[PDB]
Amino acid sequence: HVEGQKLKQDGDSFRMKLNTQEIFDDWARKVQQRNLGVSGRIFTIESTR
């Protein structure tokens, strides 16, 4: 039906607009950019004026 074809087009647009793989890739890229590791020393003396 014409209404069904329009609904299929809207669903394709929604699937394009609702990926979340880009969000997952951005989160992974941010984590890789961070690359953290701490607590090896007990009293990390953050002495500042």
Binding site: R41, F43, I45, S47
Partner: peptide
């Protein structure tokens, strides 16, 4: 009778503790 002389109970200052800590941090 050995009046007083009870060792003068005292401790290092907080600034002194921080300074010894800074020396240890240099030594860390």
């Amino acid at each position: 009778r050995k009046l007083v002389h009870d060792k003068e109970l005292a401790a290092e200052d907080e600034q002194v503790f921080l300074m010894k800590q800074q020396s240890l941090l240099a030594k860390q």
